[PDB]
Amino acid sequence: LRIIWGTNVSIQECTTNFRNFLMSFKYKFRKILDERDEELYYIKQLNEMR
Amino acid sequence: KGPKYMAMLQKVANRELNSVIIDLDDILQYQNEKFLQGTQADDLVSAIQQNANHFTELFCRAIDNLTRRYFLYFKPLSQNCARRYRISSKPLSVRQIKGDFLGQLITVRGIITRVSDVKPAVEVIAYTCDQCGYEVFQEVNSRTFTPLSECTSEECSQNQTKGQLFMSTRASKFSAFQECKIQELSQQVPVGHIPRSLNIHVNGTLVRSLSPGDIVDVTGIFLLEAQFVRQHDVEERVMELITSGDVYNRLAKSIAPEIYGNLDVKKALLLLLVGGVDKRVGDGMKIRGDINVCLMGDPGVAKSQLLKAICKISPRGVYTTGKGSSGVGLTAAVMKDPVTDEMILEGGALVLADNGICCIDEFDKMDESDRTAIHEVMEQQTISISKAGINTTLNARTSILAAANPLYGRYNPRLSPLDNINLPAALLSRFDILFLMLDIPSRDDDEKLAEHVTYVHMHNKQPDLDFTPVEPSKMREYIAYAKTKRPVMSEAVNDYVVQAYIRLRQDSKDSKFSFGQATPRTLLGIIRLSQALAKLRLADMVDIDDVEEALRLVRVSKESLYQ
């Protein structure tokens, strides 16, 4: 458990959850952020820009 | 709720506020509760008053029993809590400082002319290292400091290596610092002396409680580190002035008795310093409730004496001039501060005299830059600027008294008054009352002026008439008591006002002795003078007697040209 002084951010845990969000995200804000087809919203853009 | 200080600690634990206010009234009540139960008091109010800088760092740890989420501040007890149970909070002048009060809590009363912008001043400097990880914190106290490049950690002392340190602008604690210049009050300064200034250094949440152009009571320690700010026998003295009969004429002939006659000009000066009624429509439009009087005359009669007597009797009266530093003495200019590296604004003569009489001697000797700023506060109540450095809107409610002379010194009967007066139509069209104080040599009337000046030069006493001249405090109290009155016009005076206005407009709308025309601002000034006449009679209503006096006043103000 690595803790920077005055910071509540761990490196490896945030690294793993950022990778878990980046490998799996399919329009969840359209389902639970409000009351208002696609697949791999971040894999396609990252595979397109390279 | 219940224990209010613990509830305030719960509120700061809920993270909704950042300011802590401690009063001495709770301290006095806790001292009374401890003294009535036979316990030892061990006085706090005689110990908080001296050295509050040690107490704000000592009681803060007791509340706590770098990580300061809140800000601690104090406030003193009032005089009502001082007379009860039988000082510490007296209204102090800056001439009443004595030198030895450096470290007492003082409550100073005064106007504020110079204010600065809110700036972040650091309190503790945070340094971070990558070699050890122990972030260090140093505390600054002065205006300047030096960077601690050498490592003073607990791991680099027992080491050969002394690796580089960096600064953090995020972990460092800052404070909203602001400097201000408090000035001495006008009637509290002694005879002949000038109102000197003093510096107040504020920090934290009090940083936006000081807007310039106001009167304030500042309570703080004297190093000035402010803690709390606020802003704003007699009946026998007003009833004995009322009961003598003919209150208006007595108050007219009482002020400035060292001159001869001119009861009408100085009667309108009485209505000028009483002010009138400020009207608000409540829909985003404010009209003036003020009068502005011109004194155009030839030399020989006294002009500076009436002006000096009006500024000496009325509070916040500031004497001005035509040339000199007047261009910067009517607007806010910019200058470099000699105590710190910043630019500050210097205020003119219209900002220290906020609510009162602003007088101008030698009105035709000024320039266009003075006239464009005088006409702007003459029309409405706010100063607007568009130069580089400040772009604010300054509130100002002043009454303009002006003293002027014609083009060739004295008057000219072969010349028209539009050609005799060099001022443009928009300037005197806004001027509701212009007094043509013209001197005419005579055989009988000149002897009374000569007898009066030899009588006042023989001794300081006034002529033996069956009337006593009233002192400044009594009519100052009468003006302050009459200013709270709000008169309402009736319908019977309304039908006289509209008929006189229709007849005056038709008569005004173009020859040799003519000057100007009838405007609606003159009708509003007639309404304001009628309100001032009803305010001087302390009535809630406006009768028919005020309008017939005001029309007689405005017609005899121009009737002296035929002599």
Curated annotation (Swiss-Prot), chain A:
It is found in: Nucleus. It comes from the Eukaryota. Component of the MCM2-7 complex. The complex forms a toroidal hexameric ring with the proposed subunit order MCM2-MCM6-MCM4-MCM7-MCM3-MCM5; loaded onto DNA, forms a head-head double hexamer. Acts as a component of the MCM2-7 complex (MCM complex) which is the putative replicative helicase essential for 'once per cell cycle' DNA replication initiation and elongation in eukaryotic cells. The active ATPase sites in the MCM2-7 ring are formed through the interaction surfaces of two neighboring subunits such that a critical structure of a conserved arginine finger motif is provided in trans relative to the ATP-binding site of the Walker A box of the adjacent subunit. The six ATPase active sites, however, are likely to contribute differentially to the complex helicase activity. Belongs to the MCM family. Present with 8800 molecules/cell in log phase SD medium. Early fractionation of eukaryotic MCM proteins yielded a variety of dimeric, trimeric and tetrameric complexes with unclear biological significance. Specifically a MCM467 subcomplex is shown to have in vitro helicase activity which is inhibited by the MCM2 subunit. The MCM2-7 hexamer is the proposed physiological active complex. This is DNA replication licensing factor MCM4. The chain holds residues 177 to 234 of 933 of the full protein.
UniProtKB/Swiss-Prot annotation, chain B:
Its EC number is 3.6.4.12. ATP 1 binds at Y260, G300, A302, K303, S304, N405. One of its GO terms (molecular function) is DNA replication origin binding. One of its GO terms (cellular component) is nuclear pre-replicative complex. Disulfide bonds: none annotated. Keywords: ATP-binding, Cell cycle, Cytoplasm, DNA replication, DNA-binding, Helicase, Hydrolase, Nucleotide-binding, Nucleus, Phosphoprotein. It catalyses: ATP + H2O = ADP + phosphate + H(+). ATP 2 binds at R430, R521. A motif (Arginine finger) lies at residues 429-432. Residues 247-454 form the MCM domain. It comes from the Eukaryota. GO terms for biological process: DNA replication; DNA replication initiation; DNA strand elongation involved in DNA replication; double-strand break repair via break-induced replication; nuclear DNA replication; pre-replicative complex assembly involved in nuclear cell cycle DNA replication; premeiotic DNA replication; silent mating-type cassette heterochromatin formation. It is an enzyme of class 3 (hydrolase). Component of the MCM2-7 complex. The complex forms a toroidal hexameric ring with the proposed subunit order MCM2-MCM6-MCM4-MCM7-MCM3-MCM5; loaded onto DNA, forms a head-head double hexamer. Interacts with CSM1 and MCM10. Present with 166 molecules/cell in log phase SD medium. Acts as a component of the MCM2-7 complex (MCM complex) which is the putative replicative helicase essential for 'once per cell cycle' DNA replication initiation and elongation in eukaryotic cells. Core component of CDC45-MCM-GINS (CMG) helicase, the molecular machine that unwinds template DNA during replication, and around which the replisome is built. Belongs to the MCM family. This is DNA replication licensing factor MCM7.
